[PDB]
Design an enzyme around this catalytic site. Structure first.
Site, PDB file in Angstrom:
ATOM      1  CG  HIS A  52      -5.847  -2.837   0.042  1.00 38.73           C
ATOM      2  ND1 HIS A  52      -6.888  -3.579   0.559  1.00 38.73           N
ATOM      3  CD2 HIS A  52      -5.552  -1.901   0.975  1.00 38.73           C
ATOM      4  CE1 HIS A  52      -7.204  -3.116   1.755  1.00 38.73           C
ATOM      5  NE2 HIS A  52      -6.410  -2.098   2.031  1.00 38.73           N
ATOM      6  CD  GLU A  54      -5.891  -7.720  -3.189  1.00 38.07           C
ATOM      7  OE1 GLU A  54      -5.018  -7.066  -2.580  1.00 38.07           O
ATOM      8  OE2 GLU A  54      -6.856  -8.258  -2.613  1.00 38.07           O
ATOM      9  CB  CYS A  82     -10.538  -6.078   1.505  1.00 38.01           C
ATOM     10  SG  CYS A  82     -10.235  -4.641   0.465  1.00 38.01           S
ATOM     11  CB  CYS A  85      -9.230  -5.709  -3.204  1.00 39.41           C
ATOM     12  SG  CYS A  85      -8.005  -4.583  -2.501  1.00 39.41           S
TER      13      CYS A  85
HETATM   14 ZN   LIG Z   1      -8.130  -4.965  -0.306  1.00 37.59          ZN
END
Ligand SMILES: [Zn+2]
Ligand SMILES: Nc1nc2c(ncn2[C@@H]2O[C@H](CO)[C@@H](O)[C@H]2O)c(=O)[nH]1
Ligand SMILES: [Zn+2]
Lengths: 156, 157
Positions: A52, A54, A82, A85
């Site tokens: 992702h 991040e 999320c 993350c």
């Molecule tokens: Zn994430």
């Protein structure tokens, strides 16, 4: 200032979805107004479901600063992080999180119903000491329109 | 089957702390009794705080299978996965998690109180679907012993 880096993250999301690197998500890690890392989702490019925006940004900032803690840094996320993350942001010791859009804006165009309890303060076991700012106003509007613009770009 | 791969994850934890790669944590990803990935914590090796054993095993398994989902694979973790790694397990769509020691074992020797609600069943927003087995008996004893055996032979993180 917050507007500047959140906007840079939004642009990263657009760039990444345009080049097929991954979903419309961007993250920017900054150290005292100096940009350490400017990344987007690389899940498709890296064949990595953990890549992702991040997580990618954290990996870059850590390799660049030669330390596994980013406690002098702050992360700007175009979308609410999320669970994975947010766990990563906690483990990285980033001292402040600024995110633009609510997870619901991504869920509206079909993304996973996947929201971090520690971010929203709804956990029994996982708490959070991190400073969390949900952006408002112009930056928040820009960040939230990302998902509808992306869905429109790929409708036909 | 379960005990074999759990013991392999524990062995990975030991190997990783010995060579200074990271902390006493291992993970093993299997596809129908065939190891696809065997990993340990690489936080100190990679200068990457996301490189827990589980995330490393996910990255390697996904590279090996050339896809971003592991729906037909299971994962064995020497220790109870943290929030980050449990989120990674959810995103990877592994169909089953078997883990050795409760997170309190790792916390007692100096790691953060950092526990996944969705794994323990106390999640409100994050709701897991995968099967989750906590090890009992011999596997539990082995995974617990990991933290006494390696008390201070590694760099905390
Ligand atoms: Zn994430
Ligand atoms: N399950 C797991 N926990 C780790 C690892 N590395 C450090 N920890 C810490 O162990 C504790 C229990 O999960 C938490 O404080 C984690 O941050 C790892 O590789 N796997
Ligand atoms: Zn972890």
């Amino acid at each position: 200032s917050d507007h500047k880096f959140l906007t840079q993250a939004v642009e990263e999301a657009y760039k990444g979805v345009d080049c097929g690197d991954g979903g419309p998500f961007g993250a920017v890690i900054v150290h005292n107004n100096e940009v350490v890392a400017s990344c987007h989702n690389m899940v498709l490019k890296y064949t990595d479901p953990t890549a992702h925006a991040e997580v990618t940004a954290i990996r870059e900032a850590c390799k660049k600063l030669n330390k596994i803690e980013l406690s002098e840094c702050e992360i700007y996320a175009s979308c609410e992080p999320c669970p994975m993350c947010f766990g990563a942001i906690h483990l990285s010791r980033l001292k402040r999180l600024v995110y633009g859009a609510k997870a619901e804006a991504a869920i509206a165009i079909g993304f996973d119903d996947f929201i971090a309890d520690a971010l929203r303060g709804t956990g029994v076991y996982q708490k959070s000491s991190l400073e969390i700012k949900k952006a408002d106003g112009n930056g928040a509007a820009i960040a939230e329109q990302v998902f509808q613009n992306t869905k429109e770009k790929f409708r036909l």
